């Protein structure tokens, strides 16, 4: 029941204000004091904790949106799950102290029982559950959009010469990225007619054995389509690793920089000198 | 039935549309060998456009065909082996598979024509 | 104190097993049953809850590493902060039921008091705090590395012609990305000598007013360095938006595709036809 | 209602036919009196088509429309600017004196638009722009 | 003191190394005007390599110099206005700033030579 729960929250708000007073000392007092002045944080906290049970015992959609807004605000303000968990712990601690002192539970009785005694904690855990549920929505969404952008940015076949298709491949790549690159390169060479694919391995800091093996597989694959693979821009450590892999390197034609490699490619396709 | 052997110019053209595993593979092998032995064409051209899925058996049989009719004349696998089947061919049928022309049968015919003219 | 706390955890483990039995019904029973068989999850939970207080009342580094491993395992298994919070709530609920039934607290007394009564909940909140602290480390690290990769992949000036510097610009961009692009383009044109910069706006789905204004600013900036900006690859909606912006478009030389735009650029630098 | 709807659809599809095409040249004849929604349809179809069937120049046959509104003329000029931004000259063809007067009174800047009074002159000038296309 | 006016060929060369705000700006203005009025050179060349920070006053004064000596002869701002100062010049000194040569003073001299020869 939510009515007398709010009628006791009208003092539990002061209890939680004292709770914030006690808790400010342990976790980044200067940082929180600088980024958020104390009165507005206190009034936001009492607003979050007082109108949750102002509805008739069931739920509230408007306060659900308010709780989601509070979750995103504490995400932006610099309160991760650790800080919110500390807040819940100190909430419980000061509720314990207040009930040891105030001694006024929900139902009218000379000596209440365990029922409301733990209904309080169940409702505390429920509001914490809703808060943590609203906490991670924006984080998951931004992780997903960043992953999608990284996927679409990994293998740009858009840079295109006349009948030649270069490929930047600047960022560091892993196994997932390697599969994405091989797939995208084959798809791009299928859709667009070309004869030379200029792969720029320049840009990747360190390449292990298996990624280099996939790169050689990509070169052999575009050759087996029927387009020469003029891989360009090899760095020292990556060359050491490729040659230590033991894979044959006679079929791959290499060049130090894009200008010279594409000049050699235009030499290969003689009638593309102009 | 599924092996349309065509002779045009001083060449030979083939299109593949069966994608079956054993029976079509062996019948295509035998028909291509019999045709190339019957008519003497320096260049034979093979199409793999219709296919998008190949197991080990077909890849080995195709490499075998490459060696087969390379023992009597040059050839081009004109049609770009699709990415999935290309990857499967690399991982299993490890070879250069002759001369290639990458999906443009006009390009393959032109390449074979200029190779035979010289 | 941790000794008799473990001596009562030896039955609170069965209590929490019954807790898991009760809680499995509410949250994705088929999913959790399929991904993790019940006995291993139960033994992992009792291992997590039983050896935490096996040290002498102070702490444990080995069990701290074990708790971090448990946090990463429940992250990978599909238990976000909402599921862990539900687990904490049901932990408290079944501790309440057990103490209502078992009735055996830390200190030897005919009737214990509130001290251990709430020391139990304080320790529960503390282990939950450590769990949530270990929860977010990998997530923050992967967010940071994804952001860094997205930053380094946004504006690749690596694709380079002879005295011409093309720029892919394939992915969608925002204000932060716009500032990154303008900065990186200027830095790249400073380091490398060139005369024409081919910007490919092809690839971005939708461009608002301000990003288009920054693009025009980038064109004017590379012109004011002294290199012609032959912006190429304009889509319909983005062109509509650029022209609706009202910015002057006479100074920018445009082209439909890279091959033709670079051909026009080589026409501009006459002696680069070969 | 069904026949009204299908007839409106027919007028929708008959608005801006980019189908008339020459070698790397396009022309979009429009002859019925146009309105704001029709102007939006024309600009959308012109841009989408010129992207789909990429050609160097585009001829707009304004001849045919008696009178156009000032906002419609402004949107036509914006379409010319946009298709120039894509990389295609908007060689407007055969503007009537009344529409010319309306455009002049609009006060927008009028140098980038290339105009010829007849389709033959516009076509020959377009072939002049693509120098070796004239043969 | 900070305005090394050089005359070479049929041109004029300047290098900037003061980066001060008011005094150096005005003295450079007056010295450049007096030199271009004294000696008649069709092309004047200005260097901005040393500078990496410019406020509104210097940008306006530099555009004023461009107009100033453009009223008596063509010019090039040969040295690539650095990215920060280039951005500041765009956002405040909105102009094309004459002919430019992008950090290669040999390129600027060659461009001015070929412009004067024709």
Author numbering:
A (entry chain o), C (entry chain M): 1 to 274
B (entry chain q), E (entry chain O): 1 to 118
D (entry chain A): 140 to 274
Direct quotes from the study:
The stressosome is a pseudo-icosahedral megadalton bacterial stress-sensing protein complex consisting of several copies of two STAS-domain proteins, RsbR and RsbS, and the kinase RsbT. Upon perception of environmental stress multiple copies of RsbT are released from the surface of the stressosome. Free RsbT activates downstream proteins to elicit a global cellular response, such as the activation of the general stress response in Gram-positive bacteria. The activation state of the stressosome is reset by the removal of phosphates from RsbS and RsbR by the phosphatase RsbX, allowing for a new round of phosphorylation.
Here, we determined a 3.87 Å reconstruction from a D2 symmetrized cryo-EM map of the stressosome of Listeria innocua (LiRsbRS) assembled from co-expressed LiRsbR and LiRsbS proteins. The stoichiometry of RsbR:RsbS was identical to the one described for the Bacillus stressosome, 20 LiRsbR2:10 LiRsbS2. The 10 LiRsbS dimers form two hook-shaped strips along the core (f in yellow and orange color). A pentameric plane thereby comprises five triangular faces, all of them consisting of one RsbS and two RsbR dimers. LiRsbR enters the STAS domain as the linker helix (ɑ0), while a beta-strand (β0) is found at the N-terminal end in LiRsbS. ɑ3 is well-resolved in LiRsbRS, while it is not resolved in LmRsbR. Interestingly, the MS analysis on the phosphorylation state of the SEC fraction used for structure determination revealed a phosphorylation of Thr241, while conserved sites Thr175 and Thr209 were not phosphorylated. Close to Thr241 in LiRsbR, a spherical density was assigned as phosphoryl group in accordance with the ESI–MS–MS. The phosphoryl-group brings Thr241 in interaction range to Thr209. The superposition of SpoIIAA and LiRsbR revealed that due to the interaction of T209–TPO241, ɑ3 has moved towards ɑ2 in an ‘up-conformation‘ compared to the ɑ3-‘down-conformation‘ in a non-phosphorylated RsbS.
